[PDB]
Design a protein around this ligand. Sequence first.
Ligand SMILES: *[C@@H]1O[C@H](CO)[C@@H](O[C@@H]2O[C@H](CO)[C@@H](O)[C@H](O)[C@H]2NC(C)=O)[C@H](O)[C@H]1NC(C)=O
Ligand SMILES: *[C@@H]1O[C@H](CO)[C@@H](O)[C@H](O)[C@H]1NC(C)=O
Ligand SMILES: *[C@@H]1O[C@H](CO)[C@@H](O)[C@H](O)[C@H]1NC(C)=O
Length: 178
Amino acid sequence: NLKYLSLSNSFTSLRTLTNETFVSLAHSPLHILNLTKNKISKIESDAFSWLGHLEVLDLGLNEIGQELTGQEWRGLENIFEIYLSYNKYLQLTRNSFALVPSLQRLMLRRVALKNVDSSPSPFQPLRNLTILDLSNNNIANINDDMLEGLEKLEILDLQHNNLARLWKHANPGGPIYF
RNA sequence: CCCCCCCCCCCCCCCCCCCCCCCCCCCCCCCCCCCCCCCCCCCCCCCCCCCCCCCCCCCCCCCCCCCCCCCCCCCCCCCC
Ligand SMILES: *[C@@H]1O[C@H](CO)[C@@H](O[C@@H]2O[C@H](CO)[C@@H](O)[C@H](O)[C@H]2NC(C)=O)[C@H](O)[C@H]1NC(C)=O
Ligand SMILES: *[C@@H]1O[C@H](CO)[C@@H](O)[C@H](O)[C@H]1NC(C)=O
Ligand SMILES: *[C@@H]1O[C@H](CO)[C@@H](O)[C@H](O)[C@H]1NC(C)=O
């Protein structure tokens, strides 16, 4: 009957989240999982495949430095919020969030975001996305179709980045209308 | 039919340097909040001790009065 589980700063050595870490939570109807401040460094594929009813996943304030292949979110069929702010570095790809179309909140502040300007936008499948946070990442380049199709977006945080060149009339190809 | 040598222009890539722009970290100063300790001022409280004042109680002392008992002395009258 477990619906809420907080594991914030509960461990000394939890560096890698393999596909066997949460197998003991398979039969729990877990909705909220908090994993902040655990010095987590790597998330493997199918790490959260055992949490099918999960709605909130908080992974901020860790040392996660990797490239999000998108397989880390397999099995998250009811997820609504993913918190990833204040990690080492996150590199996005075409299918980083292709397995979680039900996502509504995505926080990516202070993660030193890389490759957010992919030709197919990493945020394209997120049709229900409402809140997106990309602040304090020193992002310099954004394509005009980064947020295409996100008709439900309501909050967009882009402060403390470097987007000045994109809005200059002398920028090659003209200003970026994102 | 075939090589080599010059000229301009257009490039590509790797380094160096200089620019704005931004991020992170740190330093200096200031401000705010919280915590701890300490000082100063004023109004008080309780307890103890000392002193003073009022009132009261008990005991005692001094003086006086009353009653009882005891003793001495004065008048007067009878009995044998
Ligand atoms: C996960 O747990 C952490 C730590 O308990 C929560 O972080 C706190 O969040 C509140 C509200 O945002 C802040 O006021 C506190 O300062 C935070 N504490 C720390 C140490 O950062 C976090 O909110 C939890 N996440 C979820 C989704 O519940
Ligand atoms: C976890 O991944 C390993 C490596 O791919 C695999 O051998 C193993 O069967 C997986 N565990 C489960 C429970 O699927
Ligand atoms: C997005 O939200 C709408 C409205 O609640 C819903 O119909 C749709 O199923 C959602 N999409 C996903 C993938 O959950």
